[PDB]
């Protein structure tokens, strides 16, 4: 319905969305609130049926399959600490749908 925030550790944040199938164009954006400022980490646009992704930033690693699409940031460090929002947009066909999850705070430390 909306994006699924995931976290990998023992250091990655992962948005997971299941496309309706009708939708042929999908954009997953990852933003971050830290120090009184919200910021785009990265975005990626997915052509369903062509199973092809277009990453708007090099920092992230987008991946596509038949139904489900995935956008990942890896190697998070102390300064990457902040609130992480998954955003999901159904571009084409209409209707346009937007799903913004409540953020999931990430705290990182490096001994």
């Amino acid at each position, epitope marked *: 319905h909306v994006a699924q925030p995931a976290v990998v550790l023992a250091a990655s944040f992962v948005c997971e969305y299941a496309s309706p199938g009708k939708a042929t164009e999908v954009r997953v954006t990852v933003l971050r609130q830290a120090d009184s400022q919200v910021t785009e980490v990265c975005a990626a646009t997915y052509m369903m049926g062509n199973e092809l992704t277009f990453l708007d930033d090099s920092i992230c690693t987008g991946t596509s399959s038949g139904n489900q699409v995935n956008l990942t940031i890896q190697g998070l460090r102390a300064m990457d600490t902040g609130l992480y929002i998954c955003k999901v947009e159904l571009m084409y066909p209409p209707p346009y749908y937007l799903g*913004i999850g409540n953020g999931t705070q990430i705290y990182v430390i490096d001994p």
Partner: nanobody
Amino acid sequence: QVQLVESGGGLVQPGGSLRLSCAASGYIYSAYCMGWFRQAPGKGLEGVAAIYIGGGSTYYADSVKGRFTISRDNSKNTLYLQMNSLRAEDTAVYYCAADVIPTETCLGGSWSGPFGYWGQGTLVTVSS
């Protein structure tokens, strides 16, 4: 998933005052940025004001800064626009808008876009 419904728009005399209510029907929070837009009779969609919900930070269009003010109270979960000293150039259809977007672009005065959640609109006629 968020819904928006504007209200308070209507007939007013030029030089008058009016405040528009936008009742958000979802979960807004810190990361969200909410704003007001207007569509002039002939001209397309213009951004009048925006807020970074999290911060106090606000943006205002050159035409309306010092006359228009934009307000929010988490308690009610509703965005407000106070329009003070109206004009023949203010008369338009005022649309409520909300989206989680970079702060620099939210307050940058270039927000615009067809993306984000939008209200049904409310008609504001002010003239004669």
